[PDB]
Amino acid sequence: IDLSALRDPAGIFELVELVGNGTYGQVYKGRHVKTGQLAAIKVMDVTGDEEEEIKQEINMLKKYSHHRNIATYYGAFIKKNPPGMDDQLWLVMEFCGAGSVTDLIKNTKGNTLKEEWIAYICREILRGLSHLHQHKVIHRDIKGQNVLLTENAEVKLVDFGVSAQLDRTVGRRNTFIGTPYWMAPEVIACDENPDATYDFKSDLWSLGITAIEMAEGAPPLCDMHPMRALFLIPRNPAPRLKSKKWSKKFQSFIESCLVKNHSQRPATEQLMKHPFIRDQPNERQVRIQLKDHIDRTKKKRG
Ligand SMILES: CC(C)(O)c1cnc(N)c2nc(-c3ccnc(F)c3)ccc12
Ligand SMILES: [Mg+2]
């Protein structure tokens, strides 16, 4: 890509406010100057050292974010600064006004979501992942914070900042990256074993952890230092839901994502056939319930 070809955003997009109290770093609520359309705008310095990472992120946004379960890319802008000073890059995308899944859990009594909500959100994440995996992309940072909701309760993935683009379906990677509590054992192995590798199945493990996060309010081992969780994830039994209150169908779905040996872990197509994902006869009411929660939360703040 050509960063020099990018337009200055003045008169096109404007920054309104930093989002989520800094939880996502330099991500802003923005607005189109002419139409008033909202957007999320990620702001970064263009240093010569992060060129490959910036290119990977723009390429993912440009090529794959049109899918209904990914927050859509609107374009990129550059604020040029004088010689010796770093230019700033803006990546502009769809604004998911209802916030994250982590926020949904925080704003729900008992910090636990109903199974029917978890089935709906997991299916939408799996559809977004299936689209990415079909295009040889590994997201590598699936977690509740990167799963957002629109005001209409549509589910959208964000943040391609640590993603990978493979050359073949069976392609492998070895970068130790991601968020510890959600990381698959085979990704964790790359920190201390230089010969260890992984593949796209790592995203399905992260999805299973995200489902536990929605059910129990936090991923397993959340109450421990991340270095201790990294030590335990490869050696502990695969996580399961603690309570037997959950349906056997949901318990079975978690048992399916959370296979430690990734060679034996299912891909998205096999997981989307699971009865927990496949059978959703109340999805219309789930979306009404989610929209009612969204509307109430918006009113409660002021
Ligand atoms: C309302 C909310 C939860 O603050 C929001 C809303 N809409 C978005 N698209 C957001 N996007 C990101 C995001 C994070 C990392 N890399 C990105 F490319 C985008 C973060 C927050 C977003
Ligand atoms: Mg989209």
Q: Is 141 in the pocket of ligand 1 (CB under 6 A)?
A: no
Question: Residues near 177 by Cβ (< 8 Å), separated by ≥ 6?
Answer: 140, 141, 162, 187
What type of residue is 253? F
Clarify whether residues 298 and 205 are in a common domain: yes
HSE-up of residue 266 (Cα within 13 Å, Cβ side): 18
The answer to whether 100 touches 149, Cβ cutoff 8 Å, is: yes
Specify the resolution in Å.
Answer: 1.2
Which ligand approaches the C-alpha of residue 66 most closely?
2
Clarify whether residues 21 and 139 are in a common domain: no
The answer to whether 157 touches 69, Cβ cutoff 8 Å, is: yes
Q: Is 159 in the pocket of ligand 1 (CB under 6 A)?
A: yes
Clarify whether residues 185 and 287 are in a common domain: yes
Question: Residues near 288 by Cβ (< 8 Å), separated by ≥ 6?
Answer: none
Clarify whether residues 296 and 179 are in a common domain: yes
How far apart CA 176 and CA 247 sit, in angstroms, is 35
Name the residue of 31, 54, 96 whose CB sits within 8 Å of the most ligand 1 atoms, as the mutation to test its pocket.
96
Q: Is 58 in the pocket of ligand 1 (CB under 6 A)?
A: no
Q: Domain range for residue 48?
A: 1-95
Q: Is 44 in the pocket of ligand 1 (CB under 6 A)?
A: no
**How far, in Å, are 115, 160, 163 from residue 53 at the CA level?**
37, 9, 9
Does 141 qualify as catalytic in the annotation? yes
Sign of CA dihedral 27, 164, 235, 115: positive
Clarify whether residues 127 and 245 are in a common domain: yes
Clarify whether residues 188 and 244 are in a common domain: yes
The answer to whether 41 touches 28, Cβ cutoff 8 Å, is: yes
How far apart CA 219 and CA 206 sit, in angstroms, is 10
- The gap from C-alpha 267 to its chain's centroid, in whole angstroms, comes to 17
Nearest CA to ligand 1 atom 5: 96
Which ligand approaches the C-alpha of residue 28 most closely?
1
What type of residue is 146? N
Clarify whether residues 159 and 258 are in a common domain: yes
How far apart CA 106 and CA 168 sit, in angstroms, is 39
The full 3-state SS of the chain, as one line of letters, equals CCHHHCCCCCCCEEEEEECHHHCCCCEEEEEECCCCCEEEEEEEEECCCCHHHHHHHHHHHHHHCCCCCECCEEEEEEECCCCCCCEEEEEEEECCCCEEHHHHHHCCHHHCCCHHHHHHHHHHHHHHHHHHHHCCEECCCCCHHHEEECCCCCEEECCCCCCEECCCCCCCECCCCCCHHHCCHHHHCCCCCCCCCECCHHHHHHHHHHHHHHHHCCCCCCCCCHHHHHHHCCCCCCCCCCCCCCCHHHHHHHHHHCCCCHHHCCCHHHHCCCHHHHCCCCHHHHHHHHHHHHHHHHHHHC
Clarify whether residues 71 and 165 are in a common domain: no
Clarify whether residues 271 and 155 are in a common domain: yes
The answer to whether 207 touches 69, Cβ cutoff 8 Å, is: no
How far apart CA 25 and CA 244 sit, in angstroms, is 38
Which CATH number do you get for residue 38? 3.30.200.20
Clarify whether residues 82 and 200 are in a common domain: no
Q: Is 19 in the pocket of ligand 1 (CB under 6 A)?
A: yes
Tell me the backbone φ, ψ of residue 221, rounded to 5 degrees: 65, 15
Clarify whether residues 123 and 241 are in a common domain: yes
Query: Ligand 2: distance of its center to the CA of 203 in Å?
Result: 19
Would you state the structure tokens that stand for residue 143, as one six-digit string?
């977690």
Residues annotated in the binding site for ATP, as ranges?
19-27, 42
Which CATH number do you get for residue 194? 1.10.510.10
Catalytic residue among 49, 103, 141, 292: 141
Clarify whether residues 113 and 232 are in a common domain: yes
Query: Ligand 2: distance of its center to the CA of 240 in Å?
Result: 32
Q: Which residues precede a break in the chain, with C-to-N distance above 2.5 Å?
A: none
Final residue in a domain of this structure, among 68, 95, 122: 95
The answer to whether 60 touches 160, Cβ cutoff 8 Å, is: yes
HSE-up of residue 97 (Cα within 13 Å, Cβ side): 14
Which ligand approaches the C-alpha of residue 139 most closely?
1
Give the number of other CB atoms < 10 A from CB of residue 124. Answer: 20
